[PDB]
Structures are given as structure tokens and as C-alpha cells.
Amino acid sequence: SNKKLIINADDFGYTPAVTQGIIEAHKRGVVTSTTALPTSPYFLEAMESARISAPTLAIGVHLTLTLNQAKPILPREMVPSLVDEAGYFWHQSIFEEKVNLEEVYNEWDAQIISFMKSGRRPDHIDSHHNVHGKNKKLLGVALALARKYQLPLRNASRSIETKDYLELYQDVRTPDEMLYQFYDKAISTETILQLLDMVVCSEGEVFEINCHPAFIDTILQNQSGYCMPRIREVEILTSQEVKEAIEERGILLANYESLAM
Amino acid sequence: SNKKLIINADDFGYTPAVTQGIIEAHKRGVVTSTTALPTSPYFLEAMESARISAPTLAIGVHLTLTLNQAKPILPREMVPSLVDEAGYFWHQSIFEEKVNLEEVYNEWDAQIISFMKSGRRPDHIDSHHNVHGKNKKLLGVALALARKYQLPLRNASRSIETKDYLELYQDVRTPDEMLYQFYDKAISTETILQLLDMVVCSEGEVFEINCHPAFIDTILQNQSGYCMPRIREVEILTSQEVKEAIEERGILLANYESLAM
Amino acid sequence: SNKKLIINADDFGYTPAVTQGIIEAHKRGVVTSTTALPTSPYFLEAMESARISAPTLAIGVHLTLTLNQAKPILPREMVPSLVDEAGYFWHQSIFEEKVNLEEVYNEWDAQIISFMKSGRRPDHIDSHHNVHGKNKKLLGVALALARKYQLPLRNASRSIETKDYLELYQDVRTPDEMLYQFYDKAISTETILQLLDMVVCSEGEVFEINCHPAFIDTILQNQSGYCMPRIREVEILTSQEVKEAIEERGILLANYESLAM
Amino acid sequence: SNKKLIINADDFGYTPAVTQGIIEAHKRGVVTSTTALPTSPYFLEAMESARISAPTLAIGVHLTLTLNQAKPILPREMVPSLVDEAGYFWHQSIFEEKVNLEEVYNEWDAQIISFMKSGRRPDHIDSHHNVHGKNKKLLGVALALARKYQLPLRNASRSIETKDYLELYQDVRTPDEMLYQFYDKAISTETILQLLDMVVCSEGEVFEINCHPAFIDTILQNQSGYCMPRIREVEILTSQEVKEAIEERGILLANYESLAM
Amino acid sequence: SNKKLIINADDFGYTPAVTQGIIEAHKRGVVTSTTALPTSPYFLEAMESARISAPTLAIGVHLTLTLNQAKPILPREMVPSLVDEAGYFWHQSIFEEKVNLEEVYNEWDAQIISFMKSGRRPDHIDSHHNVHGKNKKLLGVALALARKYQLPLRNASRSIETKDYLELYQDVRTPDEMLYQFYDKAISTETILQLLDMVVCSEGEVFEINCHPAFIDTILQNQSGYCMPRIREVEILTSQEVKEAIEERGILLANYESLAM
Amino acid sequence: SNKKLIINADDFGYTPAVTQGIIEAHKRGVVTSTTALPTSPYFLEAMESARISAPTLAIGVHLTLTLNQAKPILPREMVPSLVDEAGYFWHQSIFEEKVNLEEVYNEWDAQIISFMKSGRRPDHIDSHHNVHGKNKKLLGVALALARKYQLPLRNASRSIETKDYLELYQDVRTPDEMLYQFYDKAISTETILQLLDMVVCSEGEVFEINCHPAFIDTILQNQSGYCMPRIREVEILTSQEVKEAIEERGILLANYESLAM
């Protein structure tokens, strides 16, 4: 059986330089997909740039409850459990305890509708800080919107302990394995080969490696503690060695169209 | 629960200036969708203009049985009940009595296939002069094509008396409420606020306000008795007051992708 | 009932001049669809040309097991039954006897995923040399991928003897009739009128006429024994007589969006 | 010599509907050129629409000293002679006696630089209300700029009395005759035929007919007393009889590229 | 000095397949420039295809007095010396003795204006069948236009005998040598290498190699006796050996922007 | 006279992130112009990105003799004085004494021709490390090319001591003053305001402020010791205070089209 590998760049539309770093990683490299933040003021610009300069790039919706220095789509009065005193999303460190699931539902539904103001349907759903995999209840809300909009959803488990998350997916399509290891002190070529061998060795059909390529702008510097390594990711994801490795292993580079509902 | 508001401009492709007036109302204003006439000779040009200058605009198919000075897609010999002596569609005032439902089916099916010559699937179906809501039999024909092409269909009721139309939709998705009031002597900002409050006050999830923005050309003047107010609609739909009002009420501006089947 | 006629150009992306000959036949002529070879190194370029210069053109995936001078998508080690000693596809004359159905499945699945690297979903499936209609087992593999990706599939029967192929389609949508006669010594206007009358005379709803328009380049000359007549096809498919004939018969020119699943 | 006829639509960029009516008159008719107002807030949008939807349209700069409800590019403190007490351009009826030629030069220089924020060089110069033809001093300022930027300039004479104006141009290229009669009560096909005859019957080589095609928006309505006839101009300029009239007379349709320096 | 080599494909716009074969030879090969026939009905389509699919291609005007089965831009009554009894250009074999230089001037002026209906200025001038090099009088007409429009002109001498032709150009910029040998029986890689050596071995700075790349359509077949070798030209001009040959010789690939006035 | 201010970003095309940071600074800020390095392998990609995503951006050629880790366009055997033993440009610290002016001319000619492989003419000339201002002989070579190609040239003086440089330009148009202070430790809003005051307070008409906006990629990191401050330049140049500062001073933002010859 062939192996299908989705290499998805998180945080499309986060900032202008993140958007262009992702486009680089796709056009010159092995990124086949991205997921975009409608909660970001740069979202529509990002989607326009993709339309004209990266028309081959597959794009899903990056839901959030914890985006630093941003507000939800819905007015605070409607989603009061989701925000701090000034109306911004709660920090990931403390959000799980505050949020009300019905409000999370409404806000994420709003985020999906907001994406589609781009004139495009997302091809899938995932989340910033993997908050849809923080616990089964949040996951449950993601799966409900997946069914409602008939979109596949990122595999939420990144631990053996949460492997049972996937029994909840059922009709909602998802990669067989979430390879989340390519991050911060693991940013290197070697990690990538390692993950590729993992794909070649397992029983799965569809695999996702996520990543965070970007160019640096002050907006990213202002907004994310994960900043300078993102350029190193571009470098690795556009390297000849990486492209050859996928080649040598017969791996098929795919997108979430392979999981359409 | 959030409120989703589809603001749909009728008559895309009607005439070159109507098409550009709609594009203005979308790009500078709150129009999120339009429905296009394949029976119009300007249709394909309109769809090209949208592709290059309004790529964010959602577009559905505007079926007709009564378009002034136009002919059906199918040759007269095949749809003889639909046309006057010279082969043009019957006037709305007298069409209901003449047309044969099987011919209406074939012609509307033809209109849908004709749309898709644009290379694009419509995202929904509605009708010129709301002829799919003239009576249950015509409605029935619209719902049959909705099921056949798996497209949501505009809510046909604009009266309490026809509220029972919606019990026929079933699997065919539709807005919970048709807000048709924004027209001719009701063209003003106030009407729009009124309709918005109506949305905020009701139990519905998805609402549609239709409208007829346009620029004026001689072609429109020649062809529609509803002419000069269409520019006033552009003005109102692109006003800061209108945009702010939707904002103040937390309303989500959506399109028929929110009702995909 | 109206008649829907899909005129599909085979071999999009085969060579640069084939691609542009097909675009000509669509933009100036009656070709409404094409099917593209992801196994061709020119595939992505072809898909880009369509995006910018033929945005109205509908495009499906042209699966193959026999493309002269090409290799499968999957490495030879994974599909060893599909290739000659140097790793190229077996010649159509001898392939049926060599190939292993599981390998055919994997390779065609790979070809579909490869198409979608264009950023676009195919709207349907067919095959080079009609190899999906060579026998029921190969057909069976095509239908399995049709169901998996939820795509309509070209009618595989071109003989009375294989009419029973269609009983296997079931949920997989397909034209009611495959009109394959427009080829080599039958290339003429007359053949086309003949096929059109056939459509007007039969009970079917959806019909497909396939064809092989192209401009000539050395790459085509090097690679296909069917070369010089392809320009004659462009000429006929862009002729006023052909356009008028479809007109005179009330035939609707359609694409596989009319058969969406 | 051949006869070369430039048909130039004045007021590109005035309002969104004006802009689009001009594009229509070009794409569907005999307008070969337009002149744009950088003094208008819709100017840059107009140049983007031209770039993507009317690439064949030639565009010059429409200089002004009198545009209703508009202000100079330069701050009023720098051009005090050019404006009324509120900062707006003087009306055409009395500006002549007010303006300082040095300020006229600086402001028109500013307008040309302003045009070039579009990233395009104008292909020629003219003026709103023909103010460069109001007297020989204003003409001299216009010529000074035409020489600085090396651009052709519209023939400023519209009377037998100002025929001597042409003797000042020297190296600045211009059409041999200004045909200004197509306006307001003279808007009709007849007038156009009459002017084409005049082209045929005079000694000149290069002729310019100016015009004011537009679609109608409220903005035009509010801003100009010459409004509804502009759609009749579009009609006449896109008409078959006019295109034929030009051909039958062996007149060549040209733009100011024919007069580049 | 460096050596600058212009490789110009003649006959852009002749037929749709010619146009596309030239775009291929540019995008995949060493063609840096083309010259277009405004006298062809496919000319404007050719310039649109270049704009969107070959933005880097430089384009001049291909003037003619002899194009098979074609007519002048001007009506025959205005250029009676230029045409046979049926209104078509005289064949190259006997036009020399027929044409009136004044009519040649007006018609070539017309052709250049015609080019500019594309909304683009040609970057240089040349001629079909090298008729501007047929004798010094025809050359003088060509030079007169080159000076009027301020455009460089192809070196008209193709014999030691007409070397003195160059003494007439004065201010009109031209390549130092016309390398015309790449044609018909001399179509091969060898020839190209030979001409590159000639470039290396002469004293000139700027050299032009002309060529006739094309894809084949029936239109070309019907219109030109030089047909099938044009695809071999595409092959040779897109070949690795030719690109390498140029590099190894330290030759710079240029266009007529290098000769702008 | 008005005051015209050109804000030119140096190093377009250096790296993909530099290119995009410059597009950002233009589209969201006050950069009106850029100068591109044809000596960079990313140059043609940069010009394509500008064509489709920054059509309003003006672009000149950035000539060089000193670019780190880069080589001349011409083979080293043709320009031996311009390179170290390994074929790379001499460092700015000692190139002055090495180079042969004839080789400088040929190489810079080559760079300009190289630019024009983009299919665009540069709108002006400048140089990396201001090497055209290093002494009057290098300036003379630059002027010779400016005259050959008829292009304006950046003001080479950056000291009271080289004010006499301007006396050499003659017909070559240039800004009145080079404002070079916005660099490295002086990167701040203050500096910019200071330079705007200088514009206000001097006698000149036309001023140039140069700058080095960029996003960060590893390529920039590896290639230039001036790296992280470039993002601060983007920030400052897209800031509201800077846009306001320019307006409040009545300064006109211009590009080198204002200085075309």
C-alpha cells in the first residue's frame, strides 16, 4: 500500500512574513498544505497572496482559543468565557479551565464562516496550540463542526495516553498518524529522515507532519515566542536532501483532498 | 447561537453595468453572494469579470421563466409552453397559467448546465421574479433539481400564507428566513437596520436578505422597469453605517457555502 | 428530456503542443472537458496553463498502465508487475497479461494523488488506451478508486459484447453512452454529425464523445503513433459547421460536473 | 497619408461607474484611449482595474484646475491662487483670472507625479474643461510639462480663432485637429458620422474625438451635472453602425502611442 | 566588449500554433524575442497570450508587403500599388517592381499603428521576407518609420554586397550582423554552433539570429510552404546543448531593449 | 517648487525574503521604488513576484562590483580585474585599486542586459556599496551607461567633498540630494523625521532616501552581516507616523519615472 504524507504548515495568515515563508516552503520545498487563521487581521491578504502566487497550495482552517494578542470573531458579550478582561483570548496555559463548550462551538463555527469570506471552503480543520486535542470535550466540539461542515480533521493525539481520541472520529476522516516532532530543538534534517522512516515502517495509509516555516518580520517577533527557528524550517523543508529522502522512500506527497468527506 | 446573514445580489450577468454594480457592492460593501442568469448573453463575460476582479464573490444560479426580452436555453420546439409567439419567455404576469412542469424541469436543468459552462459549479439556486415560489408545483420542480445537483435552494416563502412551502424542502438546505423587504420604496438605510434587528430577534440560524445593486447602462434601462433605485442600493450597501450595524449586532456575513449539501 | 454531451479531449499534459491544441479546441471550439496525465513530466505545466489561459476548461484524471516512454508514479520495486526491464510501462499489446491488480490499484491511486498536487481535484476519471475497459477486473479497480475518491468514471464499453460492464457501475456515475468513433480514418465533419444524430436518437441522458486534438511538436512525434490527424481534429472541433450542428439539434454541451457524486 | 483617429474618453477614475463604463466602451466599442484624474480618490483603483481587465486600453493624465468638489494635490498653502476659501479648485467660469502660472506648473507637475504612483507613465496629457486651451499662458505651462516629461499633448484649439495655438507646440506632438463636438445635446450616432466625415474631408493625418462614456452611480450623480447622457455615449460608441462607419471610411483607430516623443 | 546575441522568432501571431511554439521556444529555450504580424487575424490573441503566459518575451513588429493570402491594413484604393488584382499582397518574387514608396510608407505606418491596438509599443522593427533589405529605397522607408517612432531596426544586409546598407542607419540602432542561416535545410544543432562561433570570431558587439519556431496547426499547413521544420527549430532551440554552447562561449542573451533609442 | 521624495529599497532580488520584505514596505508603506541585483540567482523570481503581486512598484538596476559571495555576469577571463583568485567580486575595501574601467563598463553593461532578461527595462541605475560614487572615474563609467540606455542615475555624492560630482552628470537626470543616513545604528523613526525635515529645509526639488527593508531568511543570514535591522526598517516604513510625517510636510512621494530622459 502506498504511503500518503501531508506536510502542513501551521499559521498561514499569522503575519505577512509567516505567510510568505510558508509560500516559499511550498513552492521551493515539500510543504503541501497549510492551515490559516481567520482570527488574524492578515488572513484575507494571505488568502489573496495564495490565490495569485501559490495556486497549488492546499489550505485548511486553523481554529483557535489561545492566539496571543487576538480577539475572537464573536463579540465578547457572546463568548465571555473565552476572553480575558480586555477581550483577548486566554493564554494556552490557563484557557482549558475557563472556556464554556457551547461558546467554543459558536466561536469556532464563526471562525469557519469567517474563513469562507475568502470565497474558498477550507479543505480541513486543525487548531492553534492543538487545543482540539487538549481534552475529549474540546475534541468533541471540533468533531461536531467537522460533521456539520463535512471536513476532515487533524488527528488530535500526540501521546500514547490520548490514542483513544481517535475512536471518537468515526465518520470524520483523519490521518492515521500525527507526526508532531519537528519543532524547536528537534529542527534538523535528521529529524525529518527519522519521521520519514517512521512513515515507511508503519501500517497507516495517511500521515501528517506539521511544521511552522516562516520568514521573520517584527509582527512575528512581537507575537510569537517561537520565532527564529521558523527560518531554519524553511531551509530544511526546501533542501534537496529532504526532497530526495521522500523520493527514496516512495512516499507520496499529499494534502487533505485525500481525506475528503 | 450565532446569526449567519447571506446578502445576495440578484441578476449577476443581467447587463454589463449590473454586473459591475454588484461587484462594487461586494468589494466595497456587504454583499456576500450573487446569483447569475445563464440565459443572459452577458453571462460568461460576467463570470470572467468575477474570476479576475471579484474572486471572493460567491455565485449561485438565477433560474428564470420570465426574463424580459430573453429566450430559454432549449429550442422553442422542446419547451413550447414556456414562450410567446416569437420564442421569448412569457411575462411574469401571465406565465403561471401557461407553463408545463416537465418543460420547466428540462429548461431549468438546461440553465444549470449552461451555468457550469463557466467552468464553475453554482453554490446554490434561486429564481428571477421568485418564480420557484409562485406555487408549490413550480417549487417542487426547483427542489427536484436541487436534489439532482445537490445544491441548497433559496427559501421561497415571502408571506405567512406560504410558510408551509418550507415543509417541502426536507433534505434541501435553505435559509431559515427570506428577508425580501429591501426593494423600491423601501430602499433606505433604515430598512436595512430593521431587517438586521429582525435577524437578531429571531430563532433562525441562517438568514438571506436579497437585493438588486447595479450601475446603470442603457441595456438595463431597456430591459428592466426596476432601474434607477439599483444605484441607491449600491450606495446603501457600501455605506459605513450599514457595515457598522452588522458589526454592532454581532452578525456573521455568510454565503451559501454555509448550506452546502 | 434534454441531451447532455461531454466532448472530452484525451491526453492533456501529454506534451506542450498537445496541451495547447486542446486549449484551442476548447476556447475556439466545442471541447468542454479534458483528462490529464499526471505520469507526464509536463503535467503541472499543463495545469498551470489551464489555470491562466483556459479557466473554463473542465479537467479529469487520465489513468494509465501503458503510456509509451513513461514510468509509473510508484517506484518499480513497489509495482514490479507494471514495468518492463528498464522500468517503463508495458506496451498496450502485452500489458493485460502481466499486471497484478493490487499493484494497478496502488499505482492508479498514486496517479490520482499526483493529479491533486496541481491543487485541484479531478472532476472525473478515465484511462489512456481505455485500459479500465480492457476487462472487468481492471474496470473493477477503476470503480473501486471512483468510489474511494467519489468521482464519476468514463463509460468503459465500446462494443456490444462489453455492454454488461455498466451493470457494475451502480453508485459510480457515468455517461449513458461512450461515442468513441471519432478517430483516425473516421476523422471528419460527417462522423461528428453522425454521432450527433446518434445522440439525438437515443434514450440516454448523458453522452461522451472523446477526441484527441493537439498541435504537433517533436515531443508528440517522438511519443505517439497517432500524431498528424490530431491537428485535423482541432480543425473540425473548432469549425462553424460543428458548432451549428449541436445547436440545430438542441444538444447541451456539458462536462462531468453533470455527473458529480 | 492614412487617417488616424484617437477616440479618448475623458475622466477615467472619476467614479467607479465612470471607470467601468469607459472600460466597456473600449472593450466593446471604439474608444481607444482614456485620460485619468489623479485628483480623484478612485484613481488608483481605476488603474488597477485597467491593468487586469482592460490591458489594451491606453491611458493619459487628465490635468485639472477646476474639478468640482475637488482639491489640488499640493497643500493649499503652496498653491493659494488655485483655490477658493475652502481649499477647493475654482470653478471654470472664473479660475482664469485667479491662478498664478508658477503654482499651475507646480500643481500640474504634482498631478503627473501623482499619476505615476500607479506605477505607470501616462502616455499623454490633456485637461478637464480644456483649461490648457483657455489662453496661451496656460497652454505654455502645459507645454513646459509636456517637454519635461516628453509626452504628447491634446490639441488645445477648439475654435478657428485659436488655430495659432498650434504654432507654439514645436517639438510637442499633437493631433492635427480637436473634434470636441460629441457632447450633451449633440450626443447621437449622426454626430459621430458627421465627425467621421470631417476626418475624411480635412488635410490632417491625426484627429482626436473626445467623449464622456460612463455607467451611472450615485457618486457621478452627486458630482457632475453631466450624468445620464454618458450612458448614451457608451451605447453609441459600442454600436455596430459606428464601428462600420469607421471601417467604410478607411480610418485607422489609434492612441497617443502614435504621437510618442 | 561583451558579445550580445538576440535570437528572434519571426511570425508571432501568424497562427495560434505558431504563437504557442514561439512561446515554448522562449520559455524553455534560447529565443529572447519575437516579431509579430499585425496583418494576421490572430495577432491580438497572440499579444494577449504573451501578456499572461510569456511576460518576459520581448516583441517587435514584423512589417510585410508579401504575406501569402493576406492583405494590407489600408484599403486597396489607398495602396493600389501594393496588391494584385484581388487585393492581396504581391508575391516576394515580383513586388519590388510594383510598389510605390509612399504607399509602402503609409501601409507600414498603418501596420505599426495596428500593432499598437494591442496596447503595447513594439520594441523594434523588422520585415517578413526581409523586404526592407530588398533595395536601399525600401530600406529608406523602413528607416524613416524607425526614426518617426524611435525604434531600432533589424540589420537588413544578408550579403557582403549590401554591407553599405548599414551606412544609412545613422541614429537608427541595429545589430552589427544579421545571422540568417538558420533555415530549412540548414536546420540543425551544427548550424547553431557554427553561428555561435561566428559570433565569437567577429568584431561586432551585437548579433541577431532569426528563426521560425512553431507548433503545427492546419492553419500553418495551409498558409505556409515552410511548415514541418518549424518544430525541429523548437526542439533545437530548447535543447541543453544549445544553451550550454552559448554559455561556454560567454555570449550574453539579449533583446532589442539593448538597442532602444 | 514642490518637494519630490523617492524612497528606494536597495537589494531587490537578493534573497526571497528580502524581495518580500521590500514588497511589504511598498504595499503597506512609503517605499516607492526598488533597485534589483541581476547578479543574484533569485533576480528573475523577484521580478515575477513584483509583476503579479506589486504592479505599482518601480524598479531600477542595482549595479555591483563588490557583492559578497557573488561573481560577475561575464566570465572571469573577460573581466579578470574585477575578481579575486576564486572568481568572486573583490570586497569593497580594496576593489577601487584593482579594477580596469573598460572591464567595469562591460560588466555593468552585462548587468543591465541581464536585468532586461526579465522583459522589463530598469527605470534607473544605482549601485551596491555606492561604488559609482567611489571616485570620478567609476562615476564616469556609470554615466556613460546612463547615457547609452537613457536612464537616470542615483546622486552619487554622500559628502560635501563630492558635491562637484554632480557637475559631471550633464544630461543624466538625478535627484538633487542623496539622503543615505537611514542605516544600522540610525534605524529609527526619529532619523526618518529628521531626513524629512532636511527635505523641507533644502533648496532642491528631488530627494532620494535609500533603505534596506527585508524579511529574514537563512539566505540573508548567511550572505549579509546587515540582517536583523532590516525588519525594523520594514516596521518603520509601514508606520502611520511616517506616512503622516510626509503628508504634514507636503512632500510628494515619487519614483524615478519623475526623472526619465
Q: How far apart are CA E124 and CA E10, in angstroms?
A: 12
Alpha-carbon distances of E110 from E134, F113, F122, F170, F231, rounded to whole Å: 20, 31, 30, 38, 53
B128 is in an annotated binding site: yes
**CB A113 to CB B258 under 8 A?**
yes
Backbone φ and ψ of A211, nearest 5°: -160, 170
F252 interaction partners in chain D (CB closer than 8 Å): 73-74, 110, 113-114
Our measurement of the distance from residue B213's CA atom to the centroid of its chain's CA atoms, rounded to an integer in Å, reads 12
Q: What residues form DSSP beta bridges with D62?
A: D126
If you measure CA to CA, which chain C residue comes closest to E214? C217
Q: Tell me the three state secondary structure of residue E230.
A: helix
DSSP H helical segments within chain B, as ranges?
A: 16-27, 43-53, 92-95, 101-115, 136-149, 189-201, 218-223, 229-237, 240-248
Residue D217 to residue B52, Cβ atoms within 8 A: no
Distance from C-alpha of E22 to C-alpha of E41, rounded to nearest angstrom: 17
Asked if B227 contacts B21 with a C-beta cutoff of 8 angstroms, the reply is: no
Among candidates F44, F74, F149 on the partner chain, residue whose Cβ is nearest the Cβ of E2: F74
Documented resolution in Å: 1.7
- Please state the three-class secondary structure of F58-70 as a single string: EEEEEECCCCCCC
Distance CA C230, CA C208 (A): 18
Q: How far apart are CA D8 and CA D23, in angstroms?
A: 12
The residues, any chain, with a CB within 8 Å of residue C214's CB and separated by 6 or more, are: C11, C14, C15, C17, C18, C21, C22, C220, C230, C231, C233, C234
Domains, chain F, ranges and CATH? 1-260 (3.20.20.370)
Please name the residue of chain B whose CA is at the shortest distance from the CA of residue C5.
B113
- Beta-ladder partners of B7: B209
**CA atoms of F160 and F157, how far apart (whole Å):** 8
Q: Which residues of F121-149 are buried (b: 16+ CB within 10 A; e: fewer)?
A: bbbbbbbbbbbbbbeeebbebbbbbbeeb
Q: If DSSP codes are grouped into helix, strand and coil, which group holds residue D5? A: strand
Q: Of E135, E172, E182, which Cα lies nearest the Cα of E152?
A: E172
Report the C-alpha gap between B220 and B17 in whole angstroms.
8
- CA distances B85 to A92, B75, B106, B120, D54, Å, are 71, 13, 20, 34, 40
Residues in chain E: 261
**E-assigned strands of chain A?**
4-12, 33-36, 58-63, 125-127, 177-179, 206-211, 252-254
Longest dimension (CA), chain D: 54
Q: How far apart are CA E26 and CA E53, in angstroms?
A: 11
Please list the residues that pair with A127 across neighbouring strands. A63
Taking every pair of Cα atoms in chain A, the longest distance, rounded to a whole number of angstroms, is: 55
| Residue A79 · residue A52 · CB < 8 Å | no
**For residues A56 and C115, is the Cβ–Cβ distance under 8 A?**
no
Up-side HSE of residue C7: CA atoms within 13 Å toward CB?
A: 27
Using CB atoms, which chains have 3+ pairs under 8 A with D?
B, E, F
What gap in Å lies between CA B218 and CA A21, rounded to an integer?
49
**DSSP strand pairing (D125-127 vs D177-179):** unpaired
Q: Which amino acid is at D188?
A: S
Q: CB–CB of E252 and F44 under 8 A?
A: no
- Report H helices in chain F: 16-27, 43-53, 101-115, 136-149, 189-201, 218-223, 229-237, 240-248
Contact D109, D82 (CB under 8 A): no
Which 8-state DSSP code applies to residue B91?
Answer: P
Gap sites in chain C (C to N > 2.5 Å), preceding residue numbers: none
- List chains touching B (3+ CB pairs under 8 A): A, C, D
What is the interface size between D and F, counted as CB pairs within 8 Å?
A: 41
3-state secondary structure of E240: helix
- Residue A15: partners with Cβ closer than 8 Å, 6 or more residues away: A40, A42, A214, A217, A219, A220, A223
Q: Across the interface, do E215 and C217 touch by the CB < 8 Å criterion?
A: yes
d(CA F218, CA C70): 38
E249 touches F at CB < 8 Å? no
Find the Cα–Cα–Cα–Cα dihedral C231, C235, C237, C243, rounded to 10°: 180
Name the region of D150 (left: φ>0; alpha: ψ -120 to 50; beta: rest): left
- Which chain A residue shows the shortest CA-CA distance from F235? A218
Note whether B255 contacts A: Cβ–Cβ < 8 A: yes
Q: How far apart, in whole angstroms, are the C-alpha atoms of residue C144 and residue C125? A: 12
Among E10, E259, E257, E256, which Cα is nearest to E130's? Answer: E10
With an 8 Å Cβ cutoff, is A80 touching chain B?
no
At E21, which helix (H) or strand (E)? helix E16-27
List b or e across E77-108, with b for residues whose CB sees 16 or more CB atoms inside 10 angstroms. Answer: ebbebbbeeeebbbebeebeeebeeebbbbbb
d(CA A152, CA A176): 12
Q: What is the DSSP letter of E216?
A: B
The answer to whether D124 faces chain E, any CB pair under 8 Å, is no
Q: Name residue B126's beta-bridge partners.
A: B62
> What residues are paired with D177 via a beta bridge?
D207
Q: Which amino acid is it at A221?
A: Q
Place of cell 540582517: F227
User: What would the DSSP string read from start to end of B147-175?
Assistant: HHHT--B-----SGGGGGGGGGTTTS---
The type of residue at A75 is: P
Q: Which of B179, B59, B168, B193 is nearest to B120 (CA)?
A: B59
Phi, psi of A85, deg, nearest 5: -60, -25
User: What phi, psi does F138 have (nearest 5°)?
Assistant: -65, -40
CB-CB neighbours of E58 under 10 Å: 26
Diameter over CA atoms, chain C: 55
Helix (H, G, I), strand (E, B) or coil at A89: strand
Interface test with A, best of F48, F53, F187, F216 (most A CBs within 10 A): F216
Those chains having 3 or more beta-carbon pairs within 8 angstroms of chain C are A, B, E
Alpha helices in A63-135, H assignment, sequence order:
92-95, 101-115
List CB contacts of B212: < 8 A, sequence separation 6 or more: B9, B10, B11, B183, B226, B229, B230, B233
Q: Name the helix (H) or strand (E) containing E62.
A: strand E58-63
In sign, the C-alpha dihedral spanning A48, A51, A52, A58 is positive
Query: What is the C-alpha to C-alpha distance for residues E151 and B143, in angstroms, rounded to an integer?
Result: 64
Chain A: closest CA distance from residue B66 (Å):
30
Cα–Cα distance between B253 and E124 in angstroms, integer?
A: 53
User: Which cell is A10 given?
Assistant: 501551521
Buried b (16+ CB within 10 A) or exposed e, F10-24: bbbbbbbbbbbbbbb
Q: Ramachandran region of residue A69, left (φ > 0), alpha (ψ -120 to 50) or beta?
A: left
Buried b (16+ CB within 10 A) or exposed e, F236-260: bbbbeebeebbeebbbbbbbbbbbb
Distance CA B251, CA B192 (A): 13
Which residues are registered as beta bridge partners of B210? B8
Residue ranges in chain C assigned as alpha helix (H): 16-27, 43-53, 92-95, 101-115, 136-149, 189-201, 218-223, 229-237, 240-248
* One-letter identity of residue A21: G
How far apart CA E79 and CA E87 sit, in angstroms, is: 10
Cβ partners under 8 Å of residue B215, min gap 6: B17, B18, B20, B21, B24, B230, B231, B234, D16, D17, D20, D21, D215, D216, D217
For residues D42 and D61, the answer to whether their CB atoms sit within 8 Å is no
- For chain D positions 151-210, those within 8 Å of chain F (CB to CB) are none
Q: C229: which residues sit within 8 A by CB, 6+ positions away?
A: C184, C187, C212
Question: Judging by beta carbons within 10 Å of its beta carbon (0-12, 13-18, 19+), is residue B200 exposed, middle or buried?
Answer: middle
Residue B4, SS3? strand
Nearest CA to E12 out of E53, E52, E46, E48 is that of E46
Q: Print burial letters for B67-101: b (CB count within 10 Å at least 16), e (below 16).
A: beebbbbbebebbeebbeeeebbbebeebeeebee
Radius of gyration in angstroms for the set of CA atoms belonging to chain A, rounded to a whole number: 17
Contact residues, C window 1-60, toward A, CB-based 8 Å cutoff: 44, 48, 51
Place of cell 461607474: D17
DSSP output for D112-128: HHHHGGGSS--S-EEEG
Whether residue B152 contacts residue B98, with contact meaning beta carbons closer than 8 Å, is answered with no
For residue F35, the cross-strand partners are F10, F60
Of D195, D197, D200, D194, nearest in space to D178 by CA: D195
Of all helices (H) and strands (E), which one includes residue A196? helix A189-201
